[PDB]
Design a protein around this ligand. Structure first.
Ligand code: HEM
Ligand SMILES: CCc1ccc(C(=O)O)cc1
Ligand SMILES: [Cl-]
Length: 393
């Protein structure tokens, strides 16, 4: 009843061009079985959305990577938020919601916008730049570590640590194995920065520790919650901004519309998140036998959700393979959906908005002018290098 497919969604060939295989996954049925990894897969919008919104049946506390925490030891102590189910999830989630709230956004927006404008002005002086290293990476590195309250020394560990976290959700392939082999210095740096004395006053880290006296979290929970922001808060935005710049570089008609109405910046970023889905996949584990799309999945089974495929499913989206900055994007699953839906999404959208606003106001054209190189990661989709020429407005 359930079709069995040999597609490896964690192979380099799949990462290089996932779209044909994602269509094969959607069109084979609402639920597939991936023989390569012994997991169920859901690639259509409807089933991905259904799984995300039933956390009781499709739990996160057995891991949101391939590994089942009931069977194997987690590679690092479980996240108190991403790898927790209600009710244990609820209070840590509330703390991060308040740390990354609107009032916080108001406190950081002017500095984030000024750093975005300054980066674009700097890049325009060079003209020909790498939109990954010099923009997608450089801009978040210029705002987010400071907003966390990290010291300067050791920040070179942040992107390697995040690449490790995202590779570690994958199966035990070479990408995952190599990341874990190299992990010790990055883990040691990150864990140390999570301690209260190492987080500067007023930043996100200090604010997490300050919530340890309200009864929502205890002091011994704060370091791991800081760890969540140092895991999820940087490389995601690198790949979100990279996705948006890559979309504007490939679709100059949309850059032209954005230049003509810079207030489209927020939706242009949201549409890049749908179109590229920087976070491609996450797993859940069934807690009982369950019927999903006419299929019967037993207890204790891993279910792989293809967020990027759900975001391009023609059953849900008109012209899904077109980048359209005025698209009604509400309901895309690039930030997840339901109780675990990205708690940092206001930070991500702020960074994306102010960078796209700076481009919309300062840049007339973005032309690819060198070889594009893709970066391979078991969970993140994005580029290693994007050579572009920026023409000033
Ligand atoms: C474009 C940027 C981003 C994308 C595409 C993204 C994507 C996601 C997705 C898909 C989830 C759902 C995980 C699940 O359902 O298992 C998630 C959750 C989460 N994200 Fe984001 N994220 C982004 C930026 C950020 C930022 C900037 C932060 C922190 C400052 C952050 C922190 C978190 C945390 C802590 C969770 C776990 C929430 C929970 O389990 O309740 N993310 N993100
Ligand atoms: C953006 C995906 C993500 C969310 C949360 C964590 C974490 O809690 O460590 C790590 C990754
Ligand atoms: Cl760690």
């Amino acid at each position: 009843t359930i079709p069995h497919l040999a597609i490896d969604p964690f192979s380099l060939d799949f990462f290089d061009d996932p779209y044909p295989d994602q269509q094969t996954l959607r069109d084979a049925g609402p639920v597939v079985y991936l023989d390569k990894w012994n997991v169920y897969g859901v690639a259509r919008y409807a089933e991905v959305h259904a799984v995300l919104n039933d956390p009781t049946t499709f739990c996160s506390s057995r891991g949101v990577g391939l590994s089942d925490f009931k069977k194997e030891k987690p590679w690092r102590p479980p996240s108190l938020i991403l790898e927790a189910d209600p009710p244990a999830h609820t209070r840590p989630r509330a703390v991060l919601s308040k740390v990354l709230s609107p009032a916080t956004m108001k406190t950081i927006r002017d500095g984030f916008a000024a750093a975005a404008d300054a980066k674009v002005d700097e890049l325009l002086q060079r003209g020909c730049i790498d939109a990954i290293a010099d923009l997608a990476e450089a801009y978040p590195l210029s705002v987010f570590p400071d907003a966390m309250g990290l010291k300067q020394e050791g920040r070179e560990h942040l992107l390697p640590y995040a690449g490790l976290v995202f590779n570690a959700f994958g199966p035990p392939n070479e990408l995952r194995q190599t990341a874990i082999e190299r992990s010790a210095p990055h883990q040691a740096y990150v864990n140390e920065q999570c301690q209260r004395p190492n987080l500067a006053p007023g930043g996100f880290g200090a604010c997490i520790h300050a919530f340890t006296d309200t009864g929502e979290i205890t002091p011994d929970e704060a370091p791991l919650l800081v760890r969540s922001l140092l895991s999820a808060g940087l490389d995601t935005t690198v790949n979100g901004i990279g996705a948006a710049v890559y979309c504007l570089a490939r679709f100059p008609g949309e850059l032209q519309r954005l230049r003509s109405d810079p207030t489209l910046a927020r939706n242009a970023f949201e549409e890049a998140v749908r179109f590229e889905s920087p976070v491609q996949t996450f797993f859940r584990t069934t807690t009982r036998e369950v019927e999903l799309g006419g299929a019967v999945i037993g207890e204790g089974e891993k279910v792989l959700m293809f967020l990027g495929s759900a975001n391009r499913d023609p059953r849900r989206w008109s012209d899904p393979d077109l980048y359209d900055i005025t698209r009604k994007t509400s309901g895309h699953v690039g930030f997840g959906s339901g109780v675990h839906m990205c708690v940092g999404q206001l930070v991500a959208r702020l960074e994306g908005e102010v960078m796209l606003s700076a481009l919309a106001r300062k840049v007339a054209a973005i032309d690819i002018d060198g070889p594009v190189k893709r970066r391979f990661n078991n969970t993140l989709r994005g580029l290693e290098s994007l050579p572009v020429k920026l023409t000033p407005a």
